[PDB]
Design brief:
monomer, mainly beta, four-stranded antiparallel β-sheet, 9 strands, elongated
Length: 115
């Protein structure tokens, strides 16, 4: 059914404060793609510790999925056009300095798709 997969990676955000929502730079296919997403695998790596209370989402143009842990798989992008970029979105709810900062060394996705 015209199946393929694309992948991409990049550096993520730095958060110095709670109560701030920040998006990583978009991840998108390097090859020409068409069709719709099926299963998406994701991973990220931090420099330093993870802040308690961290909320991470992975978002397409019109959908978002909550992430748990530093790697996983989701069917939440089923039927999303495969050409769409994916953004990691990060927040630690509240206020004041984040101690230490959230420092996202890398975040990546593998997107399976079909025609």
């Amino acid at each position: 059914a015209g199946e393929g997969a694309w992948q991409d990676s990049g550096m993520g955000v730095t958060l110095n404060y709670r109560g701030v929502s920040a998006s990583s730079s978009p991840l998108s296919a390097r090859q020409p793609v068409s069709g719709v997403m099926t299963l998406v695998a994701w991973r990220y790596e931090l420099n330093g510790p993870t802040p308690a209370g961290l909320r991470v989402r992975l978002c397409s143009q019109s959908r978002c999925v909550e992430l748990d842990g530093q790697s996983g798989t989701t069917h939440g992008f089923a039927h999303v056009p495969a050409v769409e970029p994916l953004r990691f979105v990060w927040e630690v709810p509240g206020g004041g300095r984040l101690i230490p900062a959230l420092k996202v060394r890398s975040n990546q996705v593998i997107v399976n798709y079909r025609h």
